[PDB]
A paper describes a structure:
As a serendipitous result of the co-crystallization trials we also determined the structure of the unbound enzyme in the closed conformation. As yet, structural studies on human and yeast DPP III in the absence of ligands have always yielded an open extended conformation. Because the crystals in this study were obtained through seeding with microcrystals of an hDPP III ligand complex, it is very likely that this procedure induced crystallization of the protein in the closed conformation.
Human dipeptidyl peptidase III (hDPP III), also known as enkephalinase B, is a member of the M49 family of zinc dependent metallopeptidases and cleaves dipeptides sequentially from the N-terminus of various bioactive peptide substrates. Crystal structures have so far been determined for DPP III from humans as well as from Saccharomyces cerevisiae. Despite the low sequence identity (36%) shared by the two proteins, both structures are very similar and consist of two lobes separated by a wide cleft. The “upper” lobe is mostly α-helical and contains the zinc binding site as well as the catalytically important residues. In both structures, two histidine residues (His-450 and His-455 in the human enzyme) and a glutamate (Glu-508) coordinate the zinc ion.
Author numbering: 3 to 726
């Protein structure tokens, strides 16, 4: 029962962005203001992309804390018979639903419910101030999402397709087969899935009618553009009728383009103004092509003061793994920290040569990638990462280039751990861990994006029998014969690997990071060159091994399914270094000070280069070979081979899993600042590092459209209620 529950004393931290914001000029602040607003508007779309009840839950809480702040509500809640412990349980839950934009954890895809009796919360909500101003709206909301807010039925606990899970990227009656069928339909029409959803309905006959709905401001009405309009029709695909519609998240996206236009007025240069014009095109029409062209302009704007990106980008939470979750961020460049990353780019092309795979599997042309350290002012969406490689359009990654980003002030929050909190470690390891995990993470994050995601060439064939590579000269180094597999027209990385695409690529990126972290030159770029360099390496690997063990929390044993892509990647890497044997990694079941079941992680420092590196190189070379040729069947057999969780000796993971769950530590919530505009001045509003502080950060997040946004999210959820 500890699962599906956010602990009262869950950690909360705020972002250090006060100083970064002060550096900006009066115009750049107006540029960052509207971009941030656009992001937060679009962030609400995640509610519709999470759970059926998430829009209702957000709207219900947004009405509560609008009338009564967390301290005003406290007096009311305690007067109704709730203990202070039970009230804090509600604040944490609300702060949870806010920081994830849904009642499911973005990192774990797990449902969480309030930690208090259902009837006690009913008394608080139905007896509140917002319930006496708009009783019709409040009581309605409570009768709609009341049971679902607390219901922990097995089918509701996790995100997923079929009867066994919950997802709003699809309808309730959808299964994996419907997703694969729809995917082939999209590849054949050359229509991207990044901003689409799939709905399978049935007529009075029982014959399933599939509907693909693109996300856009404009609806069924005709517009000027025809690149999307000429696709809005009915189809006949393998005996199954397909309909391509749009207008998804229309009122929300309408608010988004409003702020994108206003931001274009304060645009720095021409590229920033053209990319926003295309983003407006993509959100108004529903054109990923418009987004692709906008992203193309975005890569051209190198070293900007106010970096930004927005749209349906990442596909982690899509059960099939091709549909994008809406996000967007505004950040100020940290020219101080970014000095360490541009020297890495200076020798980046060099480091790509010492990678395990032959130079025929690397991008033929190496464009200089823009790598900058950023201080985040705003990151809308489900959660916040440490670093990002963008865009995810593979054709752009080998044409115009790409941008690497390390979030400076986000790493600052992560750089916080107590000695007793560190689990599955020996006492002598704890010291080196605390001392070096900070610098070691910068090492990993840098290689993860630049030389990890930023490397690798995909084999593509055009309409004619011509390839972007010489067919007669390229040899598969794992087979011996020439290449017999490639990406056809319209096929992308995600469309072919689907349900493991996200995990597979991060694992390839993670392994690259570990691999190239052994290079004394790379460490010199950050500045270590010595025994301190040796320690960073040991920590970078010990962290990886320990993460692999901790990853067992995000595995569901009954469905044989991984819920988090990055953690599945590290468990794979963990098993790769256990397959290598030679006493490199050992996991031993022990007993802690409290007497509860425990475990220990031991890693041999001297055998990292003699046993670890060659084992990782073999694994690293196989990954890229199967990615470039696009060999799914083999790619799956390899990755899902090491991603298999069984309690086979000597590790016995299923038994260790309970130990991990028993002693697990929830990740901390993050409070983000706000920007307010009075006359011509742009001020920065900061908040408390608390649950109540986080709630206040959202109550003042929409000053104008408070009541209106709650109205939009409500009716948008009401229309599609039939699907679930
Ligand atoms: Mg389902
Ligand atoms: Zn990554």
């Amino acid at each position: 029962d500890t699962q599906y529950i956010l602990p009262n004393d869950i950690g909360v931290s705020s972002l250090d962005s006060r100083e970064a914001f002060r550096l900006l000029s009066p115009t750049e602040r107006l540029y960052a203001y509207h971009l941030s607003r656009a992001a937060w508007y679009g962030g609400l779309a995640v509610l519709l992309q999470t759970s059926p009840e998430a829009p209702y839950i957000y709207a219900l809480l947004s009405r509560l804390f609008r009338a009564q702040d967390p301290d005003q509500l406290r007096q009311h809640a305690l007067a109704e018979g709730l203990t202070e412990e039970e009230y804090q349980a509600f604040l944490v839950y609300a702060a949870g639903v806010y920081s994830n934009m849904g009642n499911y954890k973005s990192f774990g895809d797990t449902k969480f419910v309030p930690n208090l009796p259902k009837e006690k919360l009913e008394r608080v909500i139905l007896g509140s101030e917002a319930a006496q101003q708009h009783p019709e709206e409040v009581r309605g909301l409570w009768q709609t999402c009341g049971e679902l807010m607390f219901s922990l039925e097995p089918r509701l606990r996790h995100l997923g397709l079929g009867k066994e899970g919950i997802t709003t990227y699809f309808s309730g009656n959808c299964t994996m087969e419907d997703a694969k069928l729809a995917q082939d339909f999209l590849d054949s029409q050359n229509l991207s899935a990044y901003n689409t959803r799939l709905f399978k309905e049935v007529d009075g006959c029982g014959k399933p009618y599939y509907e693909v709905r693109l996300a856009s401001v404009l609806g069924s009405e005709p517009s000027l553009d025809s690149e999307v309009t000429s696709k809005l029709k009915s189809y006949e695909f393998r005996g199954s009728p397909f309909q391509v519609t749009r207008g998804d998240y229309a009122p929300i996206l309408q608010k988004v383009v409003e702020q994108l236009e206003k931001a274009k007025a304060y645009a720095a240069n021409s590229h920033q103004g053209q990319m926003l014009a295309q983003y407006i095109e993509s959100f108004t029409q529903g054109s990923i092509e418009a987004h692709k062209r906008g992203s193309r302009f975005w890569i051209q704007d190198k070293g900007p003061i106010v970096e930004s990106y927005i749209g349906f980008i990442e596909s982690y939470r899509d059960p099939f793994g091709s549909r994008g979750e809406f996000e967007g961020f505004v950040a100020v460049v940290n020219k101080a920290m970014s000095a360490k990353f541009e020297r890495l780019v200076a020798s980046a092309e060099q480091l790509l040569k010492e990678l395990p795979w032959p130079p025929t599997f690397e991008k033929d042309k190496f464009l200089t990638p823009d790598f900058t350290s950023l201080d985040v002012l705003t990151f809308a969406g489900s959660g916040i990462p440490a670093g990002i490689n963008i865009p995810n359009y593979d054709d752009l990654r080998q044409t115009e280039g790409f941008k690497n980003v390390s979030l400076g002030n986000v790493l600052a929050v992560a750089y916080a751990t107590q000695r007793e909190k560190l689990t599955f470690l020996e006492e002598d390891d704890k010291d080196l861990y605390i001392l070096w995990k900070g610098p070691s993470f910068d090492v990993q994050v840098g290689l993860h994006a630049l030389l990890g995601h930023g490397s690798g060439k995909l084999f593509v064939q055009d309409e004619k029998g011509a390839f972007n590579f010489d067919q007669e000269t390229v040899i598969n180094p794992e087979t011996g014969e020439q290449i017999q597999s490639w990406y056809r027209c319209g096929e992308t990385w995600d469309s072919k690997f689907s349900t493991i695409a996200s995990s597979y690529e991060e694992c390839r990126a993670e392994s690259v990071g570990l691999y190239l972290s052994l290079h004394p030159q790379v460490l010199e770029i950050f500045g270590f060159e010595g025994a301190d360099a040796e320690d960073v390496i040991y920590v970078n690997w010990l962290n990886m091994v320990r993460a692999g063990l901790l990853a067992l929390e995000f595995y569901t044993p009954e469905a044989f399914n991984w819920r988090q892509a990055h953690m599945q990647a590290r468990f794979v890497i963990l098993r790769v270094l256990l397959e290598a044997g030679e006493g490199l990694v050992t996991i031993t079941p022990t007993t802690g000070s409290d007497g509860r079941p425990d475990a220990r992680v031991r890693l041999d420092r001297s055998k990292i280069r003699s046993v670890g590196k060659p084992a990782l190189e073999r694994f690293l070379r196989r990954l890229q070979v199967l990615k470039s040729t696009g060999d799914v069947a083999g790619g799956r057999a390899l990755y899902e081979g090491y991603a298999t969780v069984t309690d086979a000796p000597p590790e016995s993971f299923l038994t260790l899993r309970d130990t991990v769950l028993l002693r697990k530590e929830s990740r901390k919530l993050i409070v983000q600042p706000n920007t307010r505009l009075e006359g011509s001045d742009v001020q920065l509003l900061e908040y408390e590092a608390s649950a109540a502080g986080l709630i206040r950060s959202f109550s003042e997040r929409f000053p104008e459209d408070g009541p209106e946004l709650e109205e939009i999210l409500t009716q948008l959820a009401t229309a599609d209620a039939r699907f679930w």
